[PDB]
């Protein structure tokens, strides 16, 4: 664990930290400091990482309190899977009205990486079920899965697969826009609508390709991002990370 601290990884980078790894941060309203993985590039950009997938080592079918508090493992090398915790993500992303951007970074099973950036990304309080909001899609070759996707199953698909303004759901805390239970069916915790076009907390399928026959329910429950790959393609790695917007 590194010595420099601050309110986020950008604050840490601004204080002269140059190495990616584990740091304590203490956002404005945090009761106490907590550990994060900071990705610090050569340009002085310090990203605060709140989600990582890369090998299937952690089960992301976790309950409300587990998603709240965080699970998985932090590593100095950034080679482990984790969810930082909705409370922590809330505290970072809302502090001092600092405008954060979210970057989603995806890696396929062929060595290709793509990104999607969201401006003015915020996660609300537990009182509002950790609602996700953003101002706009700011670009990236992964495409804008949070806008929803035209799957073809029906003309309401896009409205029903968009993620802006969605509350967070777990199997034991259903806050989705479906009569059924998206989180329970797809085995994740996520900002579910009816149900999703982007789903980075989904089931880890080795090799990317899976199909309906692979799933117990018949729905796409993999690590999907529909604007980049078919719903039957599950990413090899994902990163969700935030930085003050001006660093874009």
């Amino acid at each position: 664990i590194h010595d420099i601290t601050g309110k986020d990884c950008q604050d840490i980078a601004n204080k002269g930290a140059k190495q990616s790894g584990l740091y304590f941060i203490k956002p404005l309203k945090a009761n106490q400091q907590f550990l994060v993985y900071c990705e610090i590039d050569g340009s002085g950009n310090g990203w605060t990482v709140f989600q990582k997938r890369l090998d299937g080592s952690v089960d992301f079918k976790k309950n409300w309190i587990q998603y709240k508090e965080g699970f998985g493992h932090l590593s100095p090398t950034g080679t482990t899977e984790f969810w930082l915790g909705n409370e922590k993500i809330h505290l970072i992303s809302t502090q001092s009205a600092i405008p954060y951007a979210l970057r989603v970074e995806l890696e396929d099973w062929n060595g290709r990486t793509s990104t999607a950036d969201y401006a003015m990304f915020k996660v609300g309080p537990e009182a509002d079920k950790y609602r996700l909001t953003y101002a706009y899609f700011a670009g990236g070759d992964a495409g804008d899965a949070f806008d929803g996707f035209d799957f073809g199953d029906d003309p309401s698909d896009k409205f029903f697969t968009s993620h802006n303004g969605m509350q967070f759901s777990t199997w034991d805390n259903d806050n989705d826009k479906f009569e059924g239970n998206c989180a329970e069916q797809d085995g994740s915790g996520w900002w579910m609508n009816k149900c999703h076009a982007g789903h980075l907390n989904g089931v880890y399928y080795q090799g990317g390709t899976y199909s309906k026959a692979s799933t117990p329910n018949g729905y796409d429950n993999g690590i999907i991002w529909a604007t980049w790959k078919t719903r039957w393609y599950s990413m090899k790695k994902t990163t969700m990370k935030i930085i003050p917007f001006n660093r874009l």
Binding site: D153, D154, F160, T161, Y219
Partner: peptide, 4 residues
Amino acid sequence: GPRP
């Protein structure tokens, strides 16, 4: 994905 979506739902019926």
